[PDB]
């Protein structure tokens, strides 16, 4: 009975990321005065199926890897931490109701970089190793800023429970008292998933270029699942919906619409700006984002004390 | 808005807590009788 | 040398964390509060030699509460004898130890 | 290194040692030990030489192993006692683990192998800071736990330290290795008397600190690192050679100098407990320390080794080094015998 | 002073905003009269059981019933 | 060592209060307001004796008096209480704020049929006094006699006789 | 390492030579094993078989030392008809020193080992007779 | 038990997908390739900047771990002491950041 | 066999230690340490330490071992009997302890160890409306003023020391 | 005592024996040291949570952080070694034998 719940959680994730590839192509194309795929299916609805069947019957590369264990294990960890990370999400009721769901998601965010590191190490090309090192550094820096922003927002919330965020946002959204934290959180989640304008491996090498068509597809599925879930996390954290305990479908429809709009905003940001340099995004974090994060952390530590606005523990 | 809702949340929390501390003595007595019954059963089994 | 700066200056830096029966948040008690309290009120101010030779009973009780050597030794003896009599066929479990008790509350 | 940063790092070292000294919780002892190690690492890297990097790496690895063993002993005592108060331990295994951890920290044999290594690869001021200041906190921790110290282990470590220090200092030509082996022998002396009377341990610690400070200050003032430059010192300044001869005489326990004061007092606390073989053996072994001190005094002041032609240029410049407390430390380390009962202020 | 402040507001607005927010956070609790309300809100939460006291014979301030007029009141938290 | 004194199974037998948690939480405030004296006496006995075996009879009184609470609910106010505890029982966290109208109707029926006043905020969490007949246990921890302390130091400080008396030193 | 000395000392002097010889051989073998372990730890052998050969050489040398010392001391205490005398242990110590000289294939080491080991064994017997303590318990 | 079941299900789906992706076109028949990147012969040179930002991340992560239990700690009774210690922790974090800024620590990876 | 779950987890824990005590390679040693850290987090999860388990996942694995493997990738350039030998030896002794303590239920090496499950020594009470370990950590600011001061000063000094000693000048 | 205490102590023992026998590298010894610290963490928190020592729950986090800080220092030293001989082999750290 519970395995039915697990399957109905994990199979729509794969369907959603395939049609997210389709939606990305269509929305990106319509924003630059052309169309997306509309030939393969009716309005291109059969495009992800054709792409999947094409990618699963292509000849594997078989690179001359130094180690085969890390080469196998990097997609394993990537897909596992992409799919495990969806379970404490309160939509409006979570699959696993946990006391420290935010800390759980932050722990898997910190743990997800080993796929990049092992993919960079397993490839025999040292240029791929350099690219993997740069991607790892970017991910851990924005992990730091994600942790501080999450700490301040939860200090407004008062507990690490993810379902309590619906209760604390019943009157007004948290984007109204925490819009600088909202903006910086959105940019940090953009830079976490190697999303434009923070991707580097596409510009002048990639860490996962040596993988076959299948493992590259699995890395793509993991990355796009991370993108969708991060948008859902931003929706739950800052733009919470009205929840009726007798009609959960109202909350489901509302936050689904909001997270769809946020994912469309991700694709919209992808097609508007040039790429950052590596040192420029390091400058953006360590010299611009971090001082404001520390200042707003002090402000949100002191603000409930001076306003008699301390939230309950339970 | 956040300060108003947080004060209301604190009031509801202390209402729930005072309900719990009103309910405490019956559960305490039930727990004492249950653990005494379990210890007595274990004592009889150890005896036999 | 142990320069007692804290007692000379009257400040408290780590005395709240030294022992287990101290003041705790929300007055949460430990599982061996009474045993350690009794041992501490015995051994206060009589020196280490008299403390280790005079109330060894209280220290043995506190160590027994802490590690539970004799309790699980007795449990091992009871379970071993029960298994031996089960194998020999002279003992059966009662219905209230099998899962049909319809318990107290 | 910036002067402000160097000052802050030195006060961090001092704060770590003080934190170990004044705390009543085992976790704060561990915290102070890590503070001391972390803050003293860059002082050994003051010159940025490969030898300094290797010395710092060896020191880091030894101190890390010692700190981990100390934490294991603390955790075992926590399990078997349920408290953290810095006092006697309540498990022989935890006492043994803590004793070997503090022996590794102090450089006791057979954990001594880093002391002649590390001291060779670091400057003279950092070596003095090591061999004097780093030995205060572990001696305090050993002072507090003597009801639980095994006598067999501590006396074995003491006799091994004394014998190995003498036989190691018998061979060297470098001054820093000689001071390292002398330090090992002196800590054997200090730990041999700990379980009988720790006031003598305090007195020997103070006397050893003053003597090592005087010798390292003399070496820094003359800018000497091997025995041949110390031989050359007779041409540049004879008073420095007289001072190092008197200080090396005092370091060997030769009466009526102050170095006879600790060890003799140690004998006075070990014949009271009817232990006669051990102090006689330790004095017989300390004769080797006296031997290589005598070799240094033969090379430096009692004869005149040949000098070079360029040394004449050094006759035209007065020294400008801040010889801080050198006359006071030279007087205090050599003529302190007639004030022997002053050790009663340490009781 | 005013020229320097306008200069750093011209070159580095991010640092100016961060320092202003930090200074406000560090000086505002000492001036707002609502910190004591936070203190007695945190004090009034009943995490533990209010264990009763044995009546020796002379305790006029302690109540005999939960609904008695004695003991602390909570009208300020009800109104605020 | 000793043998643990344990009460027989006949001493542990009482008529249970067989209701769910939401039933108790629905009427928790009125139960605290009306059944206060045996509950407070039992809790004082538990905190003073530090032994369940010495408090059993007091516990029985609780299991009597609480039952005499619920019967008065069943005789007069069965249906509004049924609706209120069902509304409490639906929600996952058993929140009080989701059942305000049923609580209002139940409280109105109780007040106009039994004269029970719901306690305000912080009223139940007060510390009260209890007049009881059982004596104070003089040794609840069963502590034995403490060891006698060492004799203290007394008298004026005379100078040391013949100085330090360390080898040849006269002072 | 305390039970080996206990099982050596509980045999009365000049009663059973075989048990005393076996106990002294065990004590010597333990000492040689410790010495060989420290030698192969501090100075690494060039091969595994070289390390085993050095360990066996040290162990056999020290075991022969102990066996010869115990055998000679017990035989001399038997034939001289006095058990409480350090001269028997002096003779056993010189026999052990001659065994050391035979093991190291030299004469000067044998003579010096005779002299110093006889003195040390006589001191050990004197301390056993008079109750001298090297690891004295702190009583003052 | 639910979390372990979910973890095992995610892990077994991941390895089933990896095995399918790595072995399904292996059964096809094709032609092999020879054993042969801009830096194939050159060794990798060390860069101090990447290691420096790694250790900076580690130290800031440790201070983040120290700063984390503030939501639980805000419900205390010594509110003045809690506020002082929280502000001191964030101030020491900012002081470390500013000292790394001033000594050219964030150079060429700013 | 479910009631021994923590004990079962503990086996994997010590097994993971033989993964890196043999020292095959820094990447494989890091993988073994990652497995051991996850297993230890599960072990402390089964004792009620949820915040400490997520501290292990967030700070040890995702914070420090990431830097360890990141520095590993800058050394041990990519391309034994002893590694497999000590792995087999350690596994054999570990299963010897497992078999002995599952056979006679009471063993000793240095301390006396019991062969029953971990569930026996648990507490029968309830903590109420709070987690005791959560408020124990939350008392870091209310009670641990001195600990906070020395830890913050240590971290600041560590930052200074790290950027000082790698300058090379 | 319990079974998990034996298992954690054995883990600490095998990590200690792994530290004390260097094979080729220094990173492996650093990893062994962090394994020892992790076993200390697990043992301490098991003992603390078993006995319901409330305040002492603040302790192992410190036991992490300080030791973790030490690990960073160790890494820097390794890098300095890697800047001299080009590799982290322990058989290059013998310049102080004479």
From Swiss-Prot, chain A:
One Pfam family hit: NADHdh
Transmembrane annotation, as ranges: 2-22, 68-88, 100-120, 147-167, 172-192, 213-233, 249-269, 290-310
InterPro entries named among the record's database cross-references: NADH_UbQ_OxRdtase_su1/FPO, NADH_UbQ_OxRdtase_su1_CS
Catalytic activity: a ubiquinone + NADH + 5 H(+)(in) = a ubiquinol + NAD(+) + 4 H(+)(out)
Membrane topology: Multi-pass membrane protein
A GO BP annotation: mitochondrial electron transport, NADH to ubiquinone
Annotated Gene Ontology cellular component terms: mitochondrial inner membrane; respiratory chain complex I
Similarity comment: Belongs to the complex I subunit 1 family.
Job description of the protein: Core subunit of the mitochondrial membrane respiratory chain NADH dehydrogenase (Complex I) that is believed to belong to the minimal assembly required for catalysis. Complex I functions in the transfer of electrons from NADH to the respiratory chain. The immediate electron acceptor for the enzyme is believed to be ubiquinone.
Protein known as: NADH-ubiquinone oxidoreductase chain 1
Species this protein is from: Ovis aries (Sheep)
Organism lineage: Eukaryota, Metazoa, Chordata, Craniata, Vertebrata
Curated annotation (Swiss-Prot), chain D:
Keyword NAD: yes
Transmembrane segments: 3-23, 25-45, 67-87, 96-116, 122-142, 145-165, 178-198, 200-220, 237-257, 274-294, 325-345
Top enzyme category: translocase
Annotated GO MF terms: NADH dehydrogenase (ubiquinone) activity
Cellular component per GO, a single term: respiratory chain complex I
Membrane topology: Multi-pass membrane protein
Alphabetical UniProt keywords: Electron transport, Membrane, Mitochondrion, Mitochondrion inner membrane, NAD, Respiratory chain, Translocase, Transmembrane, Transmembrane helix, Transport, Ubiquinone
UniProt key word Membrane: yes
One BP annotation, GO: mitochondrial electron transport, NADH to ubiquinone
EC number(s) per entry: 7.1.1.2
Subcellular location, record wording: Mitochondrion inner membrane
Known catalytic reactions: a ubiquinone + NADH + 5 H(+)(in) = a ubiquinol + NAD(+) + 4 H(+)(out)
Origin: domain of life: Eukaryota
Main localization of the protein described in the UniProt heading: mitochondrion
Family per similarity comment: Belongs to the complex I subunit 2 family.
UniProt function note: Core subunit of the mitochondrial membrane respiratory chain NADH dehydrogenase (Complex I) which catalyzes electron transfer from NADH through the respiratory chain, using ubiquinone as an electron acceptor. Essential for the catalytic activity and assembly of complex I.
Subunit annotation: Core subunit of respiratory chain NADH dehydrogenase (Complex I) which is composed of 45 different subunits. Interacts with TMEM242.
Name of the molecule in the record: NADH-ubiquinone oxidoreductase chain 2
Source organism (scientific name): Ovis aries
Gene that specifies this protein: MT-ND2
Curated annotation (Swiss-Prot), chain H:
Sequence similarity: Belongs to the complex I subunit 3 family.
Keywords for the protein's UniProt record, in alphabetical order: Electron transport, Membrane, Mitochondrion, Mitochondrion inner membrane, NAD, Respiratory chain, Translocase, Transmembrane, Transmembrane helix, Transport, Ubiquinone
Record's protein name: NADH-ubiquinone oxidoreductase chain 3
EC number per UniProt: 7.1.1.2
Organism: Ovis aries
Enzyme class: translocase
Gene Ontology terms for molecular function: NADH dehydrogenase (ubiquinone) activity
Gene label: MT-ND3
Annotated membrane topology: Multi-pass membrane protein
Single Gene Ontology BP annotation: mitochondrial electron transport, NADH to ubiquinone
A GO cellular component entry from the record: respiratory chain complex I
Keyword ATP-binding: no
Transmembrane regions listed in the UniProt entry: 3-23, 50-70, 79-99
Protein task: Core subunit of the mitochondrial membrane respiratory chain NADH dehydrogenase (Complex I) which catalyzes electron transfer from NADH through the respiratory chain, using ubiquinone as an electron acceptor. Essential for the catalytic activity of complex I.
InterPro entries according to UniProt: NADH_UbQ/plastoQ_OxRdtase_su3, NDAH_ubi_oxred_su3_sf
Compartments, record wording: Mitochondrion inner membrane
Predominant cellular place of this UniProt entry's protein: mitochondrion
Pfam families (alphabetical): Oxidored_q4
Catalytic activity: a ubiquinone + NADH + 5 H(+)(in) = a ubiquinol + NAD(+) + 4 H(+)(out)
Oligomer and partners: Core subunit of respiratory chain NADH dehydrogenase (Complex I) which is composed of 45 different subunits. Interacts with TMEM186. Interacts with TMEM242.
Gene3D superfamilies recorded: NADH:ubiquinone/plastoquinone oxidoreductase, chain 3 (1.20.58.1610)
Ubl conjugation keyword on record: no
UniProtKB/Swiss-Prot annotation, chain J:
Membrane topology qualifier: Multi-pass membrane protein
Enzyme class per UniProt: translocase
EC assignment: 7.1.1.2
Keywords: Electron transport, Membrane, Mitochondrion, Mitochondrion inner membrane, NAD, Respiratory chain, Translocase, Transmembrane, Transmembrane helix, Transport, Ubiquinone
Family the entry assigns: Belongs to the complex I subunit 4L family.
PANTHER family with a match to the protein in the record: NADH-UBIQUINONE OXIDOREDUCTASE CHAIN 4L, NADH-UBIQUINONE OXIDOREDUCTASE SUBUNIT ND4L
Protein name: NADH-ubiquinone oxidoreductase chain 4L
Organism: Ovis aries
Upper classification of the organism: Eukaryota, Metazoa, Chordata, Craniata, Vertebrata
